[PDB]
């Protein structure tokens, strides 16, 4: 399986566009958190189908499949969030019917801090002019690299996806030095996506513990499994 063919399979694994089916209206702390959680739950279902479509993923032991997804889910959701927001500065496109402004994150205590992080990182990917194919590899790497017989498979799969990202960068046709700097820059931004996801989890857990948000089953499980 060549780099181009692996990248295409990721394109094919891409989850469908998700909408929360909400008529446009002003956000309150209740409506916002209810929307974020409802959207996260829907995306989680699509995320599972996505991972299964990654060559070799289902070949992994069921234990690894579970622990990989339980640890990275929020990070994957946020990476998706940033690719959707790339062409819309100042905005966070969680979903077509869930577009938020920085000032709207002020109605929920502690979230403004996080929106600013997401907006910053997104602004950074925009500066680097992240390409769709780079997005695809990076997102897959997030899943395969969250591993904090089946072990070698994971390493092989992760290596293959890295190999694919290098290929994508090589196709851009920029100098070899600029290809090394770009690869390093994209990989270093993940640390920032990971940071904003750690904060998003802390904030979400806090919200669940207060039963302030109806935490749907899949999302409750993903959340409960992570902190544990």
């Amino acid at each position: 399986l060549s780099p181009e063919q692996l990248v295409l399979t990721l394109l094919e694994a891409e989850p469908p566009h998700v909408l929360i089916s909400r008529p446009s209206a002003p956000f309150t702390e209740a409506s916002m958190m209810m929307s974020l959680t409802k959207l996260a739950d829907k995306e989680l279902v699509h995320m599972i189908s996505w991972a299964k479509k990654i060559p070799g993923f289902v070949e992994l032991s069921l234990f690894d499949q579970v622990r990989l997804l339980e640890s990275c889910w929020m990070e994957v959701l946020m990476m998706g969030l940033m690719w959707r927001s790339i062409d819309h500065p100042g905005k966070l496109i969680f979903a077509p019917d869930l577009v938020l402004d920085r000032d709207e994150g002020k109605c929920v205590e502690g979230i403004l801090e996080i929106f600013d992080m997401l907006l910053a990182t997104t602004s950074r990917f925009r500066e680097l002019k992240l390409q769709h194919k780079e997005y695809l590899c990076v997102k897959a790497m997030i899943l395969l690299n969250s591993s904090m017989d089946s072990s070698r498979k994971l390493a092989h799969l992760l290596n293959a996806v890295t190999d694919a990202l290098v290929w994508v960068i090589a196709k851009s046709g920029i100098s070899s030095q600029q290809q090394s700097m770009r690869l390093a820059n994209l990989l270093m931004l993940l640390s920032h996506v990971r940071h904003a996801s750690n904060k998003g989890m802390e904030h979400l857990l806090n919200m669940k513990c207060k039963n302030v948000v109806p935490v749907y089953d899949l999302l409750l499980e993903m959340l409960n499994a992570h902190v544990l």
Partner: peptide, 10 residues
């Protein structure tokens, strides 16, 4: 255990 059932069904 929705995660596990979604990982074992299509």
């Amino acid at each position: 255990h929705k995660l596990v059932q979604l990982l074992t069904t299509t």
